[PDB]
Amino acid sequence: ATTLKEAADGAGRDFGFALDPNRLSEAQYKAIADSEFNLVVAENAMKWDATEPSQNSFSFGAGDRVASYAADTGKELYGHTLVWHSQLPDWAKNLNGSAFESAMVNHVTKVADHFEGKVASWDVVNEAFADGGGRRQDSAFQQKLGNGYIETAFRAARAADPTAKLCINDYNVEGINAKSNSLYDLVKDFKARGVPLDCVGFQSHLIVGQVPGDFRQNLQRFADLGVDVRITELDIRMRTPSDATKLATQAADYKKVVQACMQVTRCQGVTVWGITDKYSWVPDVFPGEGAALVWDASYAKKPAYAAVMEAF
């Protein structure tokens, strides 16, 4: 296979990337985007603030731009994301109880309905759990609606789009711990009670050299629940600058993550959170860290590239 797309295709898996529509006008970006991936997700175009900036006033331009790109290039489209505490416009954080619940179901209904038949899978609820187990406390959704909002969101979504795979996504749930254990409990319950839920995504925003040794095991127990699992926002950061050893260990980490997926028959594939290091979100959140992606700031393939390819 000359490309990761070919490597992923032959393995019958998705290998996607987080698209920023505004960069399709940069020749090298588009070239890599068209050649190496078979799945695409909007980095920001499909979030609450980008879609409903004012109550009941939807803006689908950027979202449609990403969906058009997927359709024109023949890539699978992954939807990100319906319900998420971050990037919630102020009007929403300003509604209470009932009023707030209607805004939520309505937002879930419109966005899902608008992309029906285009979006194959949706991150219906993103980051619901707290690190260390339990529910996220700083979530407006949790605070105003309590524990039942997750269920409301998924039922509203299945009803607006009867065939999209509905997933719950989170980070720091890659290995067995109190957070993934709480997630495990939720899936098991939903499944048993018949709540529509089809897949579980593991963000995998990892640190170089610190890839969970029980990643495969964790993935596997979730699949056993009769649900599909996917690696959703993969990037393995390091303290900048990088160097031979760091790149070499990062390459090794990328290989481990992809192999973990390849070993669980129900792992749909992996989506990396971007294409090039120059546009990576990492430096803006984790000051001092970076060099997390498969391509450097000069669109040069890093050792991780051949790693991913060997893993598939």
From Swiss-Prot:
Keyword Repeat: yes
Cysteines engaged in disulfide bonds, as pairs: 167-199, 261-267
Active site (UniProt): 127 (proton donor), 233 (nucleophile)
Catalytic activity entry: Hydrolysis of (1->4)-beta-D-glucosidic linkages in cellulose and cellotetraose, releasing cellobiose from the non-reducing ends of the chains; Endohydrolysis of (1->4)-beta-D-xylosidic linkages in xylans
GO biological process, one term: xylan catabolic process
Assigned keywords, A-Z: Carbohydrate metabolism, Cellulose degradation, Disulfide bond, Glycosidase, Hydrolase, Multifunctional enzyme, Polysaccharide degradation, Repeat, Signal, Xylan degradation
EC number(s) given by UniProt: 3.2.1.91, 3.2.1.8
GO molecular function: cellulose 1,4-beta-cellobiosidase activity; endo-1,4-beta-xylanase activity; polysaccharide binding
Domain GH10: start-end pairs: 1-311
Remarks, miscellaneous: The linker region (also termed 'hinge') may be a potential site for proteolysis.
Function: Hydrolyzes both cellulose and xylan. Also has weak endoglucanase activity.
Family per similarity comment: Belongs to the glycosyl hydrolase 10 (cellulase F) family.
Name of the protein in question: Exoglucanase/xylanase
Species this chain originates from: Cellulomonas fimi
Encoding gene (name): cex
